[PDB]
Design a binder for this molecule. Structure first.
Ligand SMILES: [Ca+2]
Length: 346
């Protein structure tokens, strides 16, 4: 399968919360993972609050998944040690908590140490950059940084430095990544990413690489912009790695100012459409851009954000259907899959 075609990780996000996509119950999905991939990311169950049961740490469910990976040919990318969304914040992660900075330290120290030797790499900090699409409380930018509870408590971006040093100290063997979305657009957020990373480098922070989530549409952003955005980060350092962490590709673009070019019906791309053919070319050009701009040393992996289309967080978006992944609803490989094969093989 796909992983045989590369000498860097080829990974997939897996579900473990019941429902049809849950990897523990779906032998069809288990079989695809073992045949095609050599790394998994937990789609959900390694987020912050999942490390607790009440006020105590609990690693039961995540240990099960990490063990499954070790038994079935997969390394693990840990997603994620620090991340703002309140749905996954531990209860300690609150402006009402006098013990914040200590509880933050305990979090990173405990979790990173717990998984030492079992988890290859981590998203140490995820989504530290401001994004208007992504500001439900209307906090606004602090010179490009998200004013998350971590930022507010530390009084600035120093939490990022601390998270990285603590992770490094707790598990010196893991590759440590900073992860974010929309940074492939090569606009304002990419600039903010440059600022963020440069500051970490200036401070001597043990960041090993940068993750681009790569939640793209078929025709936006342009591949030239994707390529240049990566180039800008590669140029910051002679050793900084680049990983594509959450790749998926939406046929439909509701943000292009043209509402006449959508596939509005689930049946539209059930079998064949211009969209699935473009999606093949889109996966292929992105895996090509990555290879062309990221030197081999420095390639930390490519991961797609789920196995089969109905598992995707983008299966429906903006009340429209989409088909974002490499396998279809019947778990058959799509043209997308072939696009990856062609890219990997040259
Ligand atoms: Ca459109």
């Amino acid at each position: 399968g796909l992983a045989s075609l590369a000498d860097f990780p080829i990974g997939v996000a897996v579900a473990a919360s019941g429902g049809n996509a849950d990897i523990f119950t779906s032998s069809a999905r288990q079989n695809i993972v073992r045949a095609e991939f050599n790394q998994i990311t937990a789609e959900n169950i390694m987020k912050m609050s999942y490390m607790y049961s009440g006020s105590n740490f609990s690693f039961t469910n995540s240990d099960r998944l990490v063990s499954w990976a070790a038994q079935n040919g997969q390394t693990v990318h840990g997603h994620t040690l620090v991340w703002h969304p309140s749905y996954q914040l531990p209860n300690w992660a609150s402006d009402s908590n006098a013990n914040f900075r200590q509880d933050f330290a305990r979090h990173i120290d405990t979790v990173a140490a717990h998984f030492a030797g079992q988890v290859k790499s981590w998203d140490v900090v995820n989504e530290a950059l401001f994004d208007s699409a992504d500001d439900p409380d209307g906090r606004g930018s602090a010179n490009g940084y998200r004013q998350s509870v971590f930022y507010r408590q530390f009084g600035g971006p120093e939490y990022i430095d601390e998270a990285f040093r603590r992770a490094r100290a707790a598990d010196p063997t893991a590759e440590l990544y900073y992860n974010d979305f929309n940074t492939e657009e090569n606009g304002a957020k990419t600039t903010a990413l440059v600022n963020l990373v440069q500051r970490l480098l200036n401070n001597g922070v043990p960041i090993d690489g940068v993750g681009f989530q790569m939640h793209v549409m078929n025709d936006y952003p342009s591949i030239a912009n994707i390529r240049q955005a990566m180039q800008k980060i590669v140029a910051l350092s002679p050793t900084l790695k680049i990983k594509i962490t959450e790749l998926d590709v939406r046929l439909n673009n509701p943000y292009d100012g043209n509402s006449s070019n959508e596939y509005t019906n689930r049946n539209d791309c059930a079998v064949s459409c211009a969209g699935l053919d473009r999606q093949k070319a889109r996966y292929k050009e992105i895996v090509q851009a990555y290879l062309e701009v990221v030197p081999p040393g420095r390639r930390g992996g490519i991961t797609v954000w789920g196995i089969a289309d109905p598992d995707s967080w983008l299966y429906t978006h903006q009340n429209l259907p989409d088909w974002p992944l490499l396998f279809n609803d019947n778990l058959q490989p799509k043209p997308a899959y072939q696009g990856v094969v062609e890219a990997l093989s040259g």
